[PDB]
Amino acid sequence: TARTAPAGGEVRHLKMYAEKLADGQMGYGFEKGKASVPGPLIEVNEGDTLHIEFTNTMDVRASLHVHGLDYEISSDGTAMNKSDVEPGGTRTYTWRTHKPGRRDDGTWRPGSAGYWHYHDHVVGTEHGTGGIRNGLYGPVIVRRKGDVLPDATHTIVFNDMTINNRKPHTGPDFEATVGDRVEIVMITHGEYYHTFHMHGHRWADNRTGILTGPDDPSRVIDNKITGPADSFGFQIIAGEGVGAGAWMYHCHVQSHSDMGFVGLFLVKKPDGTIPGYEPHEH
Amino acid sequence: TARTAPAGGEVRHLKMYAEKLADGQMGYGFEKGKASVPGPLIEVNEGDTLHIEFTNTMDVRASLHVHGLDYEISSDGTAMNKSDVEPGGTRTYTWRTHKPGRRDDGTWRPGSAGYWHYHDHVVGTEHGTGGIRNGLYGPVIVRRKGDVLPDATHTIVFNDMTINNRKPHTGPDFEATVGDRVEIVMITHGEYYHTFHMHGHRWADNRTGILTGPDDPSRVIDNKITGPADSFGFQIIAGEGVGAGAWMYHCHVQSHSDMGFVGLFLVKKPDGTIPGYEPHEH
Amino acid sequence: TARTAPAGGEVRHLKMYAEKLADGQMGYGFEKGKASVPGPLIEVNEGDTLHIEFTNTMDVRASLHVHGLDYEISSDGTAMNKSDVEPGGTRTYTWRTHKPGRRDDGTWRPGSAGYWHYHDHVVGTEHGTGGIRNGLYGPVIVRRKGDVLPDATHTIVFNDMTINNRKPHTGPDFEATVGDRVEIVMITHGEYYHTFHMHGHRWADNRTGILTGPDDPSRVIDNKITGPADSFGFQIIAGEGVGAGAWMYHCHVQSHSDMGFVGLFLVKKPDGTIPGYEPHEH
Numbered sequence A, B, C: 001t002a003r004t005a006p007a008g009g010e011v012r013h014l015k016m017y018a019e020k021l022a023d024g025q026m027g028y029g030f031e032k033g034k035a036s037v038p039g040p041l042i043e044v045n046e047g048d049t050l051h052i053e054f055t056n057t058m059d060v061r062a063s064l065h066v067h068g069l070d071y072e073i074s075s076d077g078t079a080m081n082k083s084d085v086e087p088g089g090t091r092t093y094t095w096r097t098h099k100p101g102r103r104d105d106g107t108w109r110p111g112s113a114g115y116w117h118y119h120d121h122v123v124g125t126e127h128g129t130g131g132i133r134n135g136l137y138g139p140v141i142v143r144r145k146g147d148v149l150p151d152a153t154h155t156i157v158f159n160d161m162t163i164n165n166r167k168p169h170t171g172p173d174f175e176a177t178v179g180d181r182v183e184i185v186m187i188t189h190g191e192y193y194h195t196f197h198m199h200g201h202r203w204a205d206n207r208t209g210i211l212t213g214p215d216d217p218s219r220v221i222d223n224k225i226t227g228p229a230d231s232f233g234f235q236i237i238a239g240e241g242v243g244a245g246a247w248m249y250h251c252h253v254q255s256h257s258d259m260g261f262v263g264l265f266l267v268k269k270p271d272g273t274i275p276g277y278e279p280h281e282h
């Protein structure tokens, strides 16, 4: 039987930094000197509270703003609400999450669970256009009790024309073995719409990307249109019914894929081999 | 317990006008001299019939065309089907709605319920491009029996680059008190795609925007891509789990928000105060 | 009672050709000299295996690549995986499908059923941009056991600015009689986003486009945003609740419809008449 998320409700503390990278980009990290683009994954259970002690190490104002989760206005990360951070300064942002449940009026309160993201809101413009462009974004996962847990989670961000702020024809590639349970967090940012496509695999267009049983009528898809600040996620069994292989993923807007914004889901046999893929050639 | 829609099935009569506004725009109204952009909300119960006596007060042909509802071809509001209205003229359009139910072949007929809209179809071009651009659009809500009813309904239209045909940096803003049940009808028009985003609140991506219970697998979101003539709607509890505040909503396409196509969901305490928002400054 | 799909699980064999058409386009067909744009419909039941003996009759490399269905890497139809076909050559592609079911870990494997499509992947560029532009695309339907079957299926492809590679103002038009069960496969290709809209009819935004009963919360819509390589499908009862008529369908992006990328769903009475439509005028 698969591993499932437990009941949430813990108070968690975390340290985060925004830093200026040597190449001109901007990144978040849990440790000074280890910023990354995309920023590190934040994963919690519904009911958890997260206190993020955030330090802006840059020479310009920056902030941390989150989609989906609960936060008071003092943590929305905007200049308007006095919620951003001065150069060199520190601020504690508080994000909360809640379980679903019956309200007193008989209606159903939705829970926080889902695939979300955080990003800057004050670098370059008052909507963080420069910070987002430079790499100040990252994924957030909120698990409902009983959600299936993966072997591994990969984050794919279509940021303007780039994937994860990388140059054309440099992936990123991800690797799995046939049978691995692989999770994908898909995020889009910037100016353009895109269509995310994966070869050889498919998922359900609902909250978790998977179907619990025969009664769920959601569309099963391998192609999905997205726009700036859209986020969704899903799980696949690597190679299920299709075998090992170098399975492309890409934006399917034809000029975008033609520019080289493509990557590989390298699904291996146990011996590491991939049919039709020769390592000493890529 | 919350208020819910009753069983429908009434014949309703209504008067509507299309008018040329002093500033060059075009608007619908229920009373001559009270046209608005967006046009007034039309709200009915599944099963209702609506007879709209429509007068074109303009000096060009205009029409009324509706999404989603039942209408015979004599009420589709197009030039091709002889269904538009000459300058100064009057025409009675008939819109019908139906409840869902079992067909004789055992399949399930969907009902009319949902978030829809009406707009012009002959001003400027034979697809109403000029009429839509000038402001001839408005919302329609069809309620299913038992649908939860809100305290108030607001209409947000992304029309080309504008929100509700307003200049940049002029909202519109909407107001609520913490705990109000607020309904949003979201409509998009024109040439461009957008992504609607609200700070501090979220909803379900299904027919009503809310979940009835734990079995609904729909994605819970705060960001949604839309295109011309898309319509959706939802309800939120103002400030639920997040408190009072000036909560932004905006298109999240970065250049669109940078141009100032943003507004505020001003959620107040009972005393009218909003933390971090000073009235004598906006 | 309506006709429903039976249990699948047959091995099917098929012959397909890619050909260069006299007007400069490129098309797939089941018979040499009978290529079409869109290519012919491939329709199977979940569990079926399809062996397609594909001959490239053109003077450039071409391939066959499919969305959604199961295929080993030797049938993905790409140059990278040595899976395309040389001029004049032949290759057998194998597509498989599977039923949904319970995995050993207790989770639910989704089935192949849905609305999918096939297209070229090596003409013009290594993502088939030229082949797709020239007309190398077609629809695939995979039926689940018990899926409702239509009287007829029509394929509408928004390919760049064209519908089905046709010039503006040339449809295509489709015909039905009031009460026919009509299926639409909607596919989008190329560079642009679109919004598909039909007058006088609506469908459910889920896997099959129809609701099985009162518990399905999916949005009922008549307008839907799409991007390159998106596919969805649905069924309608022609004229249900609205009667005979020339019911437009079009992209609702205003400049796209203004250019003439529109068609007619001609719903007739038994005597062939259509109110407000005069044949000797179109």
Ligand SMILES: [Cu+2]
Pocket: A127, B199, B248, B250
């Ligand atoms: Cu914002």
Ligand SMILES: [Cu+2]
Pocket: A158, A193, A194, A195, A251, A252, A253, A256
């Ligand atoms: Cu793209």
Ligand SMILES: [Cu+2]
Pocket: A197, A198, A199, C065, C066, C067
């Ligand atoms: Cu593909």
Ligand SMILES: [Cu+2]
Pocket: A067, A119, A229, B252
């Ligand atoms: Cu955002």
Ligand SMILES: [Cu+2]
Pocket: B127, C199, C248, C250
């Ligand atoms: Cu129309």
Ligand SMILES: [Cu+2]
Pocket: B158, B193, B194, B195, B251, B252, B253, B256
């Ligand atoms: Cu926008």
Ligand SMILES: [Cu+2]
Pocket: A065, A066, A067, B197, B198, B199
């Ligand atoms: Cu936000």
Ligand SMILES: [Cu+2]
Pocket: B067, B119, B229, C252
């Ligand atoms: Cu319309």
Ligand SMILES: [Cu+2]
Pocket: A199, A248, A250, C127
């Ligand atoms: Cu591909």
Ligand SMILES: [Cu+2]
Pocket: C158, C193, C194, C195, C251, C252, C253, C256
């Ligand atoms: Cu279009």
Ligand SMILES: [Cu+2]
Pocket: B065, B066, B067, C197, C198, C199
């Ligand atoms: Cu319409």
Ligand SMILES: [Cu+2]
Pocket: A252, C067, C119, C229
């Ligand atoms: Cu494709």
